[model samples]
Target: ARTVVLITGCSSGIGLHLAVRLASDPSQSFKVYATLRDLKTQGRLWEAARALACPPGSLETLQLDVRDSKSVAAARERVTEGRVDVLVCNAGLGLLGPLEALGEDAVASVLDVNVVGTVRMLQAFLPDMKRRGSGRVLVTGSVGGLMGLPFNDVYCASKFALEGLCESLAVLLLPFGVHLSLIECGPVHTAFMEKVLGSPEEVLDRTDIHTFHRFYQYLAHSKQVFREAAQNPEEVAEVFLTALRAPKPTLRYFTTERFLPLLRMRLDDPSGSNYVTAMHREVF
Candidate 1:
């Protein structure tokens, strides 16, 4: 029997690649339910699967807006038709603006999708998984969740919440034989940069004190650094596979060129300098 896996944010990037790769593996035999905000925008995901030469029945795309409880309920009904072995919470957006400059709507929306959406999905599907006594949950987080970034405060805040949310779930789900994993994703070549919410051009000329103008300037600098270190989405998908199939999935996975050295500083020193040192060390 094939394992049923529901993956969110599969319209593009890592989620798309993971859907395709998992579907293509004969041994895995996954009935992949890939969700998108709109079915009309799923051309990119289909293109990605075709590029990998995936078989026709490997992936099924569904319309899912995590903010909508009705949509989540519909997904629950669909996924519950079979044995759901995994749920990958991968849908999210990037916000790159000073916290003060960020509009309340944008900040709320970021939390709605990245943080609350993950929670909603868990609420929708986890109870069912728990009843079965077996399942895996993967939340796509980011390095920003672990370390602070000046300009992208909103995104970082959501990821920080993500880490907290998953950790809590991990502890609660232990008795049910359910596993939860959080992926601290590194800079990936995705549409996040192009789509990131930046300070308005109106603010471009305003050297004002509302919302930390200097903080926005610093955020601009860090955004450039991530653009430089961008990794391929395929690499991230590989990690997803490992998380799904590993005999013992790790609690956290950081997809970066260097994480150990920085993690050591944060764990060993436990001081302000240690935090600052990690941020500076990642400047490359």
Candidate 2:
């Protein structure tokens, strides 16, 4: 019996790569449903899957906007016999710039899409996993979830909230033979990063704001860091594949070697001052 693995935000990046990787598996162990918020943008993913020579019925694409319950439900219904053995909560939104640059709507939109969206997916699918007493829930989390960066205040907040939510939920799910894993990845080469770094020029032009200059500098610095250190989406997909197969998946699986030391900085200092100072000084 092939496992039914449904992944979100599959238009590109980690989600798309993971779907194709599993679909191309020589073992033919997974039946993949790669989902994206917009179906029209799915051409590239379909082309890649076909080019990989994925066996028929092994891979399919569907429309699922995590922000919308109806869209999530409709996509869930399309799964063969309504089963999802593995749920990859990979869909997320990123907001950058000075806090003032984002209005109430922008902040809410970030939380809604990044945090609530994950919750919505869990809400829709977790019950069946619980009922069956076997499943895996993997999340595409970030290093930002562990430590806050200067310009990513709201974006970090959403991921931080998600980290807390997953940690708390893991307690209950473990008893049912189900596992929850967080794929804590650092900067990855993806369109998602492009979206995160999008259009900061307008915010940088505001000379009147003191934080804007620092924020702009940090963005420039971080861009270089990502360019040099970012992992490929395939690297993350390999982590997901490992977690899915592990008999006892650890709660957190980090995808980047460089990110571990920074995460350790926070863990090593209960006061959190060390991590904060390092981030401030390193970026400035």
Candidate 3:
């Protein structure tokens, strides 16, 4: 029997790659429910599915808006026998710019979709997973969660909150035989980077903040840094696959090698000047 996996945010990026990769497995070890906010945006998924010769029961696409509780419940119903062996909470939105310049609604939407979105998904399915005494939850986490960034203040906060959310629940879920893994990804070649880079101009134009110039320079430099160092989305998905197959999945998985040194800096000393200087050095 194959694992029943449901992945959110399948329209593009990591979720899309992971869904197609799992569905295309030659051993037929996965039945994937690839979901996105709008079915109309599923062209790439279907194209990939067909190219891979995905079997009838191997892959299915559905509409799921994580921000909407009703939509989440409806999506859960469509899963095979309402059982999700692995739940991939990959849907998220990124917010960039100074905290002072970002409007209340924009900031709230980031928290709602990035942090609360995962909570809503868990609320919809964790009861059943707990009863089964076995399931895997893989979250799309980031390096920003572990350290702060120049223009990504709010986005980093959302991810930091996510790290806390998953860490707190991991121990509690262990007794129930459920596993939660956070995939700490660095820059991956995805549309997300484009969005993050594009926002700096508008922020610089509208805000009179003293840091806007520095923020814009950081944005431009980081763009080049990631461009030269970014990993392919499939590479990240391969880590997710390994996590799924492990009998005891780790609590955290880092997908980028280049970013590991920076993470180690924080782990080595939370309040050290070296770590703080390294962060600013990357930006300025």
Taking the tens digit of each residue's C-alpha lDDT, what string does model 1 give over 1-284?
78789999988888888888888776757889999998987998888778877788778888899988899888777764555788999999777654555678988999999998888999988887899888999888787887776566788889899988988888888787888998878777865664453556655553356544564555566567557777888888888888888767878887874655665666677666876765755442
The TM-score, computed over Cα atoms with residue i paired to residue i, of candidate 3 is 0.95
lDDT of candidate 3? 0.88
Candidate 3 residues 1-284, lDDT tens each? 67899999999889998999999999988999999998999999989888888887799998999999999999899885669999999998887777788889999999998999999998887888899888999999998887888778899999999999999999799888999999999888865675647564578666865778776787788788777878898899999998888888889998977888887888798676778798888677
Pick out the ten consecutive residues of candidate 2 with the lowest summed lDDT: 200-209
> lDDT of each prediction vs. the true structure?
0.79, 0.88, 0.88
lDDT measured at residue 159 in model 1 versus the true structure, 0 to 100:
89
Query: Can you tell me which runs of candidate 2 are displaced by over 4 Å?
Result: 191-201, 204-209
**What lDDT is reached at residue 32 by model 3?**
96
The TM-scores of all predictions, comma-separated, are 0.89, 0.94, 0.95
Error of 1 at 241 (Å): 0.4
Which segments of candidate 3 are over 4 A away from where they belong?
A: 199-201
Model 2 agreement with the true structure over 98-123: per-residue lDDT tens digits: 78777789899889888999999999
Q: What lDDT does candidate 2 reach at residue 91?
A: 89
